[PDB]
Amino acid sequence: MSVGFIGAGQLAFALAKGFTAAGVLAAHKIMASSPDMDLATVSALRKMGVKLTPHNKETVQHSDVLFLAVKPHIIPFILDEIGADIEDRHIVVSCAAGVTISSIEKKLSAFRPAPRVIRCMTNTPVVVREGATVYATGTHAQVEDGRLMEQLLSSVGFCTEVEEDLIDAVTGLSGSGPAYAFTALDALADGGVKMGLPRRLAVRLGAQALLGAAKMLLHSEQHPGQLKDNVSSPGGATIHALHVLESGGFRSLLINAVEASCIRTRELQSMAD
């Protein structure tokens, strides 16, 4: 099977690296196009063995599954450029935040009537095969197209089908989520440094603490509040630290973040639906 990437940014590189590391795709069965070849992301894809071309048309010809890993305001230009080159065999997978299936189908249908479109929202940890991906199938997607998508994206993390009207909220949670985690880990490490740890050890310990806690929850049937209860001895250090988190409205800030990212994602709609 042939996979192509339009756009060679962080997400394109991350998926290719994840895909090849899973053994589900040979790097040569992958082609990627970028309008900017000076990107650092484009340098590393060459070392992988991924074919690179400056013309999106060449990507479309080599590819069967076609990932649109470009910015939301760029999608309509890409669709206008290659819409004439879409064939029956193509599955077009848009990774752009906010951009609706119906808006993509509308553009592509001016060229050929039944484009097979899938919309997805993934995140950068696909690069270490621990991404979180959702997808929704378009009007003309065959039932096997969604199955194919799920099998491919399951190789690099969690993947599940959702109704399209959930994807803006997913973007605010697992799409933007890694950034919330990177911010938290920087701050936790500053906290470790303030109390006397070397920075390198503090980063390692904080990241290991977050990874292990996340894995515990994924492998548990218990509520996060129950796992929280299990950490804190009465009168102990942990419950004292939880109090100061609570006094600052820590929970409210993370709710605010998911909401703000979701609301901004809805504003990012560019084309007519």
Ligand X SMILES: O=S(=O)(O)N1CCCC1
Of 140-199, binders to a second copy (CB under 8 A) are 157-158, 160, 162, 165-166, 168-199
* Alpha-carbon span 229 to 207, nearest angstrom: 21
Write out the binding residues for NADPH. 8, 10-11, 34, 36, 56, 70-71, 97, 230
Write out the binding residues. 6-11, 34, 36, 56, 69-72, 95-97, 164, 230, 237-238
We find the least distance from the C-beta atom of residue 40 to ligand X, in angstroms, to be: 17
The tokens 């390692």 sit on which residue?
Answer: 204
Judged by CB under 8 A, the residue of 27, 44, 148, 257 near a second copy is 257
* Alpha-carbon span 208 to 206, nearest angstrom: 5
Q: Answer for the pair 120, 93: CB distance below 8 angstroms, yes or no.
A: yes
217 binds, among ligand X, a second copy, none (CB under 5 to 8 A by kind): a second copy
Write out the binding residues for L-proline. 164, 237-238
202 binds, among a second copy, ligand X, none (CB under 5 to 8 A by kind): a second copy
DSSP output for 89-110: T-EEEE--SS--HHHHHHHHHT
Structure tokens given for 142: 């065959």
* Alpha-carbon span 45 to 42, nearest angstrom: 5
In the region spanning residues 92 to 131, those forming contacts with a second copy, defined by CB under 8 A, are: 97-98, 123-128, 130-131
C-alpha dist (Å) from residue 204 to 117, 176, 199, 213: 41, 22, 9, 14
In the region spanning residues 19 to 78, those forming contacts with a second copy, defined by CB under 8 A, are: 71
Judged by CB under 8 A, the residue of 49, 139, 215, 272 near a second copy is 215
User: Which amino acid is residue 51, in one-letter code?
Assistant: K
Q: Name the residue nearer to ligand X (CB basis): 89 or 182.
A: 182
Q: Looking at the chain, how many residues does it have?
A: 273
Q: Answer for the pair 228, 242: CB distance below 8 angstroms, yes or no.
A: yes
* Phi, psi dihedrals of residue 132, rounded to the nearest 5°: -125, 115
The arrangement of strands across the sheet holding 131-137 comes to 51-53, 30-33, 3-6, 65-68, 91-94, 116-121, 131-137, 157-161
Q: Does 204 bind a second copy (CB under 8 A)?
A: yes
We find the least distance from the C-beta atom of residue 26 to ligand X, in angstroms, to be: 27
We find the least distance from the C-beta atom of residue 261 to ligand X, in angstroms, to be: 6
In the region spanning residues 217 to 246, those forming contacts with a second copy, defined by CB under 8 A, are: 217-219, 222-246
Q: Name the residue nearer to a second copy (CB basis): 114 or 188.
A: 188
Question: What contacts 193, CB < 8 A, 6 or more positions away?
Answer: 199, 202
We find the least distance from the C-beta atom of residue 137 to ligand X, in angstroms, to be: 20
Structure tokens given for 16: 């290719």
We find the least distance from the C-beta atom of residue 146 to a second copy, in angstroms, to be: 17
We find the least distance from the C-beta atom of residue 9 to a second copy, in angstroms, to be: 8
Write out the binding residues for NADP(+). 6-11, 34, 56, 69-72, 95-97
